[PDB]
């Protein structure tokens, strides 16, 4: 029993989910879902479709190369059996996932660094234009004060 990766769309494939196409070279393409599979059949580009991990890595929205990503390989030469080694692997998996999520959040917080300065600049330009729309606001606030206070006077 194995979890596979979607060929077109890079999502996990669990047992009983999706479809597989066997090409004439014994190359097997497993598909996440009918959306990823039909995009394959219509021959669309996965590096061009924006909702895929291939696009996100190639465009630099996600971190692509890291020491935490050098751990899951296809292991073709097996080791015998060792209860202690299995327990160490099961601990190291959780530690590795924790480190990887921390580094991914750090990558996002670095690439989203200018979204306070840009917002202040557009807000100050909008406020610096249209002065007489700010006098309607000044009249509206003073009308909200006096009408409520004489209603609170009652």
């Amino acid at each position: 029993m194995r979890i596979y990766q979607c060929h077109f769309c890079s999502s996990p494939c669990y047992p009983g989910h999706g479809i597989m196409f066997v090409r004439n070279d014994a190359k097997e393409f497993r598909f996440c879902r009918s959306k990823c599979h039909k995009a394959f059949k219509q021959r669309r580009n996965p590096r061009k479709l924006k909702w895929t991990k291939a696009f996100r890595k190639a465009a630099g929205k996600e971190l692509a190369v890291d020491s935490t990503l050098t751990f899951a390989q296809r292991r073709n030469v097996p080791v015998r059996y060792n209860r202690e080694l299995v327990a160490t692997t099961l601990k190291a998996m959780a530690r590795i996932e924790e480190i990887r999520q921390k580094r991914e959040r750090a990558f996002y917080k670095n690439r989203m660094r200018g979204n306070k300065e840009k917002d202040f600049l557009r807000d100050k330009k909008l406020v610096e234009s249209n002065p007489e729309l700010l006098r309607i606001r000044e009249v509206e606030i003073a009308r909200k004060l006096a009408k409520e206070q004489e209603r609170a006077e009652s």
């Binding site: 029993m1 047992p15 009983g16 999706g18 597989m20 066997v22 004439n24 014994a26």
Partner: protein, 136 residues
């Protein structure tokens, strides 16, 4: 009755009714095979006999060598192109319908099979497995 097949065959989706053209996948000299009957099929009013991957059929040769034509021969279906289910769970399909020429005892007439072979056919027929280099 079921001659040459080692063991039993479980249920697989049938893809090829009587009257279909499939490719010839060995080097015997034929190009395509026209399906005229299916060995070991049931009887029902109005229902066509249909073959699936790993079945012995009776076929004729339409394109290919001039010696092979105008005669009826047994064949075995090795690639299906209609999606069936593996019991370790995934649905899967090939690119084309294809079979090889055989005698009634299950032995093969050619010497090598081109392209992949379904593992259900290769597990059901031992002489198909000995003549194929790619099994799914």
């Amino acid at each position: 009755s079921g001659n040459g097949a080692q063991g039993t065959k479980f249920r697989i989706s049938l893809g090829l009714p009587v009257g279909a053209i499939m490719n010839c996948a060995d080097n015997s000299g034929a190009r395509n095979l026209y399906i005229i009957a299916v060995k070991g099929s049931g009887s029902r009013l109005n229902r066509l006999p249909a073959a699936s991957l790993g079945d012995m059929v009776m076929a004729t040769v339409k394109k290919g060598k001039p010696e092979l034509r105008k005669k009826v021969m047994p064949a075995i279906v090795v690639r299906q192109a209609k999606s069936w289910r593996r019991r370790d769970g995934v649905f899967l399909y090939f690119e084309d319908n294809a079979g090889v020429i055989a005698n009634p005892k299950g032995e093969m007439k050619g010497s090598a099979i081109t392209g992949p072979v379904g593992k259900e056919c290769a597990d059901l027929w031992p002489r198909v497995a000995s003549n194929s280099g790619v099994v799914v």
